[PDB]
Amino acid sequence: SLALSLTADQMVSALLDAEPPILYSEYDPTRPFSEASMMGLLTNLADRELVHMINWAKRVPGFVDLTLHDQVHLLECAWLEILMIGLVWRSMEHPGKLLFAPNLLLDRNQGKCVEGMVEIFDMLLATSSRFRMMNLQGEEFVCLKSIILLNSGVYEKDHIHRVLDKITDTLIHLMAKAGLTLQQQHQRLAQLLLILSHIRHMSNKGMEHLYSMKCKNVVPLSDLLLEMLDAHR
């Protein structure tokens, strides 16, 4: 594995370079928001984002060294988490709003159009506020997102934790470089990692919500999305 020999600067560069694009939604502004249409927009966006996510994960240092079954397992567990932390990050400077896509900006009241969704919106919006108050940096976000990928399904595995330690080394390097004292560094590291607990909680909720919408037959789910959902069921 050549991921263990990366300096923290190189780790950051690789992660930044591997970043997926910000996809647009198939939003038609003229079309009045129904539950089915809104859910259609969200799941269709997710579907196109998964493909970029797959190719992104392969460029996360260490992920390639894993076997195919393990690569599958990690993405199956963490995909909604990764979608969500991306959304939260994109929505940082849009208070009271979630930027699912540049053309799909939704506030709380619109989440009400889909039953059970607004509670998820509130949690996402609060995560976005948290990142904003912390002034989350781009370099930190990509470290966090990669952590999610390797951490969420980990419970060989020793290699996974070696890379995870590497990313912690990276986060700390970022913080030291921004001028934080040692105390501030470990404190910020903790604040950032404790966010991952709530992202997990949200994903668990969204996964259940997604499963209910499938059984509701409201939105046609893509075959890939239908398989990513059976991983948790």
């Binding site: 797959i54 190719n55 195919l68 690569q71 599958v72 993405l75 199956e76 075959d223 890939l224 398989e227």
Partner: peptide, 9 residues
Amino acid sequence: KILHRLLQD
């Protein structure tokens, strides 16, 4: 699975 294909290809 589909995920397996994309990861492999």
